[PDB]
């Protein structure tokens, strides 16, 4: 379970919808040094509490925008985490994936979807006809 | 003519529609509403 107190908010029209209860939902948790006003990702203003906060958001981009552009940039809060919550109740922490923010290089991270050539050396699509491989996926 | 109910006043169709509505159309639904009200479990 995710712990924290929801920010003071009188209600809004940009909150969760059927997708939250049916497919997936996101939660962003952070700790603030004081009670202050922040902008909700989908409009309106909310008041983050003194201790640790928990906010439910419909999309992952809401958490990245709130944590990155407001918490880090404006409030100097660097401990925010984003969780993906499924209807069955399972919760996985997706940001930061390994506890280190992606913009900082961290050991043990593998190279994913790396092409060992310059982009101008991709093969022509005529060579890959009926093979099902895209030019950028070609070896 | 005096073989039917009529009205020389304005909108004489208003009694024509409202007498049935108040006296033998709506009263049974109103009684149903009151009966549901007075039978509700606590």
């Amino acid at each position: 379970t995710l712990e924290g107190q929801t920010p003071i908010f009188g209600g809004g029209t940009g909150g969760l919808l059927t997708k939250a209860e049916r497919e997936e939902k996101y939660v962003i948790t952070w700790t603030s040094p004081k009670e202050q006003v922040f902008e909700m990702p989908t409009g309106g203003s909310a008041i983050m509490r003194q201790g640790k906060n928990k906010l439910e958001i419909a999309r992952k981009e809401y958490g990245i925008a709130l944590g990155g552009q407001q918490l880090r940039a404006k409030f100097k809060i660097n401990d925010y985490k984003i969780y993906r919550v499924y209807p069955n109740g399972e919760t996985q922490m997706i940001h930061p994936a390994d506890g280190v923010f992606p913009e900082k290089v961290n050991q043990g991270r593998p190279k994913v979807r790396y092409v060992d050539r310059n982009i101008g050396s991709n093969p022509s699509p005529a060579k890959l006809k009926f093979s099902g491989v895209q030019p950028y996926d070609a070896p | 003519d005096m073989t039917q109910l009529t009205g020389s006043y304005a909108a004489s169709w208003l009694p024509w529609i409202m007498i049935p509505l108040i006296f033998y159309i709506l009263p049974f639904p109103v009684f149903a509403l009151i009966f549901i009200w007075i039978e509700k479990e606590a």
Binding site: I8, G11, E21, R22, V37, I47, N88 | -
Partner: protein, 172 residues
Amino acid sequence: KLNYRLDTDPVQPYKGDPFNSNFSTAITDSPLARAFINNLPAYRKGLTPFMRGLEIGMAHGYFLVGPEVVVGPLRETAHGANLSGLITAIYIAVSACLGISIFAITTFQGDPRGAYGSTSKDSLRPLRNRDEWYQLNGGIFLGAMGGAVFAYLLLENFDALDSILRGGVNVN
């Protein structure tokens, strides 16, 4: 120094959840609005799906006859206008019932998508089973056909009913 003043707010979050995209207003949460909406045949507690459809069909089929009788293209004659209004109600209701049928066919495959899935909590869409939709559709069609005919019969006999409501039937 920050005072949201939520405790004295005339408009509260809906059902105490500030993040459900809804407000507690007079339309959505007042005692009269809740009593009226929740006791309509679509939401009335305990009603069987067929009984829900029967009352909805009766109400809708009855008034759908009217528009073509008064301003329709057969309005010049009483007999023709009534027939056109009855057919218009039948065509609309049958088309709607066909839509309700194919809605049930396509929605309820495996775990339904959207608001009709198993984990959905949409209180405004309580018919969560395929069987309930087909029972509702049967009630909708029969109620709409009956209500349309009831309006058709009253309009077809409007001359007699007008004498009825004025006491002209008491001459002899």
